Amino acid sequence: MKKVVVVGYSGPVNKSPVSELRDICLELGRTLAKKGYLVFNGGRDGVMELVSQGVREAGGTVVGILPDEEAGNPYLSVAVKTGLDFQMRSFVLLRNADVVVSIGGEIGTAIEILGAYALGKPVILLRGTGGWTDRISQVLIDGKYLDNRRIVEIHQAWTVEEAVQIIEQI
Amino acid sequence: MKKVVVVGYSGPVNKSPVSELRDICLELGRTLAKKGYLVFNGGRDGVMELVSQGVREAGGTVVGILPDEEAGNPYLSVAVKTGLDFQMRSFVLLRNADVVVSIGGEIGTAIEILGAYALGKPVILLRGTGGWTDRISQVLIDGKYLDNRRIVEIHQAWTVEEAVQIIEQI
Amino acid sequence: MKKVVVVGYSGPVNKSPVSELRDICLELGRTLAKKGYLVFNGGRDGVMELVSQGVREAGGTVVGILPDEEAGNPYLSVAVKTGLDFQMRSFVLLRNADVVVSIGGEIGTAIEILGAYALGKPVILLRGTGGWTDRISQVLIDGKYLDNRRIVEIHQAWTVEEAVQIIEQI
Amino acid sequence: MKKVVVVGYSGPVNKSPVSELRDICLELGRTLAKKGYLVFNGGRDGVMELVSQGVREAGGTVVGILPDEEAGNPYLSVAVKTGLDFQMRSFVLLRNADVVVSIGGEIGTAIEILGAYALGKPVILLRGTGGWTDRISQVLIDGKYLDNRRIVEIHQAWTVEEAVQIIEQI
Incomplete structure (x- = not known):
């Protein structure tokens, strides 16, 4: 019932920089499924595909929120077409989160x-995964906030086990 | 694999004009589930709630596309928040349909x-259900279209069995 | 500074069915402008273009709200791009109206x-202009509404002078 | 003809951190107007209000893209309502830019x-103005980019005169 949104690099699953993140992605997906969380993501390839594969492998449900004319990775329990471009699609995707877990990523993830x-x-x-997930950590205010209104805390985990642990810890 | 979107009256399920449409709405929901179709709707109450109940009763999957960050009826297999208002939510809803079935409805259904x-x-x-479903049938161009570009045909069915039959006939 | 949105036929501005409305469109435009009203439209062609042209001819301002990345007729005082498809662009367009004036039109206008x-x-x-403007008048509840919640009245005018008159009357 | 979008802090114009940025905001606005650029902004208070005042002072035109059915600051030549939340409103705002100038700012501006x-x-x-405008400069890839696809260069200027100079330099 608790909903977690996962974001990260897009692009071919079999090439860098997403290929080096396979085990972490699959572990994240399976673990979320095992814990009974409903997973949401941008529905494309890359990290999104691998985490989905992991959730489906463990029998969990994963919902994809797709931009305009996209098909979705083959592991989606449900593929939701929006008709929106990449960025706006992301915001409707964020609405479905109780928590967000980031892995690597380029500008879309940022x-x-x-x-x-x-x-x-x-x-x-999920530190150590590169891209903006690591880059954004270098500009936190008080090591926890993205602006001076300190809206909500940004957490940091170096391990999938550490990550879910934080989700449970609210 | 086939996705059918159902639209209709909103409002309390236990009062008019939606109460009179209980059996048809449940029949519609169950039949869609039994046939293996993936059901989508506006996620609120009224016809949306009853069709969902019917889908879930038969073990089918029904997905709700919600306006803003609402809650949606308790029978949704998956509730999708959009952060969009009623009308725009409707257009991301329509993007998920292979076919749309209409039951009654007020301006939103129209x-x-x-x-x-x-x-x-x-x-x-689904004629005889009142609201705009019956009202819009009184302005069809050549009895099948909503405008001179004749984009796609507007089918009519006086029975749930007659409805699905049309879907199958595609 | 009453904001009036005008909507209607899109398409070649020199052929049927919009060429015949050439005068009522240009005239509504100039009148709207001479009365000091700010005008908004879907910024494309058809009715939208002539009303734009009529507003500039009389020296007023006409703002167009564009679907996604299209250009917008050459009379727009300001051309606002949205990144939205045709239907969603329309809803941001409607948010800019104190009153809406309808001429002819196909499904977009409906x-x-x-x-x-x-x-x-x-x-x-604006009756007698055809399209959905005249078609929708045949299904008015109590001759003034579009649904049983009677949200707001739908006014009918057979003349540009009659139309503006209604706008002034609020 | 050339459209520049300016983004920055929102909030009361008479208090920190936007009050300290009064002169730069007014100079930016006036200079854009004098050079003949069409100015767009998020339409609210803060930096947006001051830049607008500067544009109107110099007789230029400034158009506001408003979140929801907001009112907008009192210097807008045209106020465009969207019915969209803050972030999505921003994306339709960005579609109207040939170039973006940033001043201070919190998460929205980021x-x-x-x-x-x-x-x-x-x-x-526009450096020295604090907030995310300065903060984002500490994470540029090759001193110019925001992600490894190097979509477009992020320029830096320490003066209004320097800023407009860069815009002219295309």
């Missing part, structure tokens, strides 16, 4: 990380 | 029936 | 007429 | 700066 914060959604950065 | 057509989605009106 | 009503915006149908 | 980049819109950070 917008989602910042958006999750503006909407008061707790964010858990 | 906008959806019209919206469906503009997006080239076949619409099946 | 959706706008119905949407204006759902948002609570008084609509003035 | 999302706009990142969004601008994802859309291929050159951004000019």
Whole structure:
């Protein structure tokens, strides 16, 4: 019932920088499924695909929120077409989160990380995964906030086990 | 694999004009589930609630597309928040349909029936259910269209069995 | 500084069915402008263009709200891009109206007429112009409403002078 | 003809951190007007209000894109309502830019700066103005980019005169 949104790099699953993140992505997906959480993501490839595969492997449900004319990775329990472009799709995606977990990522993920914060959604950065997940950590205010209104705390975990632990810890 | 979107009256399920449409709404929901169709709707009460109940009763899956960050009826297999208002939520809803079935409805259903057509989605009106479902049938061009560009045909069915039959006939 | 939104036929501005409305459109435009009203429209062609042209010819201002990335007729004082499809662009357009004036139109216009009503915006149908403007008048509840919640009245005018008169009367 | 979008802090114009930025905001607005650029902004208070005052003071035109059915600051040449929340309103705001100039700002401005980049819109950070405009400069890839696809360059200027100079330099 608790909903967690996962964001990260897009692009081919079999090539860098998402290929080096396979085990972490699959572990994250399976663990969320095992814990009974409903998983949401941007529905494309990359990290999104791998986490989905992991959730389905464990029999969990994963819902994809898709931009305009996209099909969705083959592991989606439900593929939701929006008709919206990438960025706006992301904001409707964020609305479905109780918590957001970030992995690597380029500009799209950065917008989602910042958006999750503006909407008061707790964010858990899975450190060591590169991209903006690690980059955004270098500009935190008081090591926990993305702006001076300290809307919600940005959390940091170096391990999937540490991540879920934080989700449970609210 | 096939996605059917159902639209209709909102409002309390236990009062008119939606109460009179209980059996048809439950029949519709169960039959869609039994046939293996994935059901989508506006997620609120009224016809939306009863069709969902019917889908869940038969073990089918029903997904709700919600306006803003609402809650949606208790029978949704998956509730999707959008942060969008009623009318725009309706257009991300229509993007998820292979076919739209209409039951009664007020202005919101009308906008959806019209919206469906503009997006080239076949619409099946379930006649005798009142509201705009019956009202829109009195202005069809050549009895099948909503505008001179004849984008897609507006089908009519006086029975749930007659409705699904039309879907199958595609 | 009353904001009036005008909606109607899109398409070649020199051919049927919009060429015949050439005068009522240009005239509504100039009149709206001479009365000091600020005008908004879907910024494309058809009725939308002539009313734009009529507003500039009389030296007023006409703001167009564009679907996604289209150009907008050459008379727009300001061309606002949205990144939204045709139907959603229409709803941001409607938010800018104190009153909506309808001329001819196909499905896009029908959706706008119905949407204006759902948002609570008084609509003035300029009768005899055809399209959905005349078609929608045949299904009015009590001859003034579009649904049983009687959100706001739908006014009818057979003349530009009659139309503005209604706008002044509020 | 050339459209520049300016983003920055919101909040009361008479208090920190926006009051300290009065002169720069007014100079930016006046200079844009004098050079003949069409100015767009989020339409609220704060930096948006001051830049607008500056544009109107010099007789230029400034258009506001408002979240929801907001009112807008009293210097807007045209106020455009959208019925969209803050973030999405920002994305339709960004579609109206040939270039984006940033001043101070909290999370909203950060999302706009990142969004601008994802859309291929050159951004000019007006340094020394604090907030995210300065903070985002500490995480540039190769001193110019916001992600490894290097979509478009993020320029930096320490003076209004320097800023407009960069815009002219295309």
